[PDB]
Ligand binder design. Structure first.
Ligand code: HEM
Ligand code: HEM
Ligand code: HEM
Ligand code: HEM
Lengths: 141, 146, 141, 146
């Protein structure tokens, strides 16, 4: 469960991301395909080369859904209902992959926001991304 | 796969009793029922909407035998799992696009099926040997991914 | 979430376990310790030899806790509240281990319930033990 | 482990720039803050009730440096991580009773810290080579568990 302090931490951290969210989503994805090549099995239809437009475009979508989550932190299941449906019934991504993308988002944030990525903030973001993952795999079976 | 000789003899001992045809079908079927997201790879198999639909699907049953035939062939080459499964690895990666975590889930379901079929004969020590084997087979199948 | 049919399946299977629960809990633990030796690091104070009285005694407690969760299947977070605090604050067992014990419980039930351990029931039990593990892990941070 | 020469040299080049004192202290402390259950192994270090307390803790800092020192010495032996960490694996299992899953957590935390410290220079390719090293080390530390 996210505490009041976690919520504050995540809001602050995400706030500084601001207009770079798109670029960071893309970066996290690239970091994921390279570090954990098994995740590429879910995107055989994408050109996955460095800087490709599918990845760029997909990064924005991911980052935007996260912005939405932060804004609806107190009501995530409802705000993410449609994406939960998507991941569970159509895409059917194995749950173990959520942890991998989450770590890569954390590394991306650590690389771009040195001042803001304090230890307490690091802890809150990890909890937040986990909470997001639980919701997204909530309707799998 | 670091397997003691007594581990290895326990595995082969039990395996000689397995009806591979029937066990392959039960294991693949149960995979699709317990972990329904794995159904994403078999839409051409037809009706998979309920347990009986999955478990009695002739296409599931025939595919199950194909999987276990390959697994058996693996138990005959325990010291070279990676070479034995290389072409199957490439294929599952480059053509079929199957996340290797699926190989781990199947292994655990196969372990449940063996226990289901053999009862007390599936002793803790025998389970422990089979757990090493299914992990080794899963690692071998994942090894050519890139 | 557990569905009505899941709840029915779980009460039926566990009902058939009956007075064998303690024994099955002990065997589940033995299976885990031998198949996944890293789990032993949480029990350095136990005698872990086969037939160990300590293993037997602890098997019974695991089994009684599961019997209670089954008895309160519609209120598990509250029924297991105390156990969740113990695991989170005193014992601090890494979450990954719950999956291992759960798998060993299923293997144990399969070995002893040949007629009841149908595909539908196997599925319900797996979902049930995963909901139990989630509760026990919910207050870790 | 299966490390490419360009991968081997990327790792080495970056490690030449790491301040072990700072990074060690930061990695161990963050592990304790982000995954509070890992504090079970360090009761005797003192106050760990808050991040500031953990990060301020001199035993934590001193111990963090020792860990990265050991890590430092593993990178000079990348073709034999197992032999290099054998006694340490034995100690972590037999004397300390540490679940190896914790080794994976420390690894991922380490990667986050290298990222935090080096920013731009910690590119996706550099990350990938470091994920391989970190898994390698975790695996070597777990290898003598029984
Ligand atoms: C942090 C958790 C994640 C979030 C917030 C997220 C978000 C999204 C969003 C917003 C979409 C676009 C849906 C649309 O077009 O309206 C999407 C699609 C997709 N996601 Fe996720 N995702 C997450 C994790 C994952 C991971 C772990 C995988 C598997 C590695 C994955 C695989 C996919 C795939 C394959 C698509 C379809 C892409 C396409 O064909 O365009 N997602 N996701
Ligand atoms: C023990 C591990 C496994 C082994 C030994 C195995 C073996 C095989 C074999 C021999 C084939 C036929 C190859 C061919 O058509 O040329 C096959 C096909 C296939 N496998 Fe696997 N398999 C395993 C696990 C899995 C699992 C876990 C999945 C996905 C959940 C999977 C997905 C597929 C698919 C989608 C096909 C092609 C189906 C078709 O003909 O349409 N495999 N496998
Ligand atoms: C199915 C999920 C589990 C349940 C229902 C469960 C239940 C229990 C119960 C009832 C107790 C006794 C506490 C008391 O005496 O009041 C206990 C203690 C304990 N559990 Fe769990 N447990 C579960 C999973 C695990 C796992 C996965 C581990 C670690 C691998 C673990 C490690 C322990 C330890 C080390 C103790 C204390 C034993 C002692 O010192 O006497 N448990 N658990
Ligand atoms: C990068 C992976 C790790 C390495 C290379 C490593 C290495 C070391 C080394 C060199 C020591 C000093 C032993 C001595 O004094 O002779 C040590 C001690 C210790 N390690 Fe680790 N370690 C790692 C991860 C962990 C983790 C994740 C934990 C638990 C969270 C842990 C728990 C301990 C404990 C409790 C000690 C004893 C410290 C004391 O003297 O109080 N280690 N480790």
């Amino acid at each position: 469960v996210l505490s009041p302090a976690d919520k504050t931490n995540v809001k602050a951290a995400w706030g500084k991301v601001g207009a770079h969210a798109g670029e960071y989503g893309a970066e996290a994805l690239e970091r994921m395909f390279l570090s954990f090549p098994t995740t590429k099995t879910y995107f055989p239809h994408f050109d996955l080369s460095h800087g490709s437009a599918q990845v760029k475009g997909h990064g924005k979508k991911v980052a935007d859904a996260l912005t939405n989550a932060v804004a609806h932190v107190d009501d995530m299941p409802n705000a993410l209902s449609a994406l939960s449906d998507l991941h569970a019934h159509k895409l059917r991504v194995d749950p173990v992959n959520f942890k991998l993308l989450s770590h890569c988002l954390l590394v991306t944030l650590a690389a771009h926001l040195p001042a803001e990525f304090t230890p307490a903030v690091h802890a809150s973001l990890d909890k937040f991304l986990a909470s997001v993952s639980t919701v997204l795999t909530s309707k799998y079976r | 796969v670091h397997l003691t000789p007594e581990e290895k003899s326990a595995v082969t001992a039990l395996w000689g009793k397995v009806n591979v045809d029937e066990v392959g079908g039960e294991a693949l079927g149960r995979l699709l029922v317990v972990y329904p997201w794995t159904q994403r790879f078999f839409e051409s198999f037809g009706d998979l909407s309920t347990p009986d639909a999955v478990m009695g699907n002739p296409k599931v049953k025939a595919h199950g035998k194909k999987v276990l035939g390959a697994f058996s062939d693996g138990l005959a080459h325990l010291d070279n799992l990676k070479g034995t499964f290389a072409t199957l690895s490439e294929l599952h990666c480059d053509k079929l696009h199957v996340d290797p975590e699926n190989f781990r889930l199947l292994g655990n379901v196969l372990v449940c099926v063996l226990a289901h079929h053999f009862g007390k004969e599936f002793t803790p020590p025998v389970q422990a040997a089979y757990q090493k084997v299914v992990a080794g087979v899963a690692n071998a199948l994942a090894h050519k991914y890139h």
